[PDB]
Amino acid sequence: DHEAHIKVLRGEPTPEEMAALMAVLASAGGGPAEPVKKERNMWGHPVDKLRYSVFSWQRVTLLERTHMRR
């Protein structure tokens, strides 16, 4: 076991109060849910809108890397 658990550092709640606390915290916990994936869509990416000199090193380190990085 190496999950980081909730800790009650001070106080000793009765089981009813532990249940109220955990129910409220679990209702507050929200948003991401399961780890869905944002699908890759490079259409109209900002790096493609920039002017690069024909010999710009940013063609390698910015443009190409942005397209290739996965």
Binding site: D1, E3, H5, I6, K7, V8, E12, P13, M18, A19, M22, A23, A26, S27, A28, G29, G30
Partner: peptide, 18 residues
């Protein structure tokens, strides 16, 4: 799992809380 003063305490909850 919750720790309370160093006690472990399992709490079981529904999978669908907000």
């Amino acid at each position: 799992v919750v720790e309370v003063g160093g006690r472990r305490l399992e709490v079981s909850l529904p999978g669908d809380l907000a």
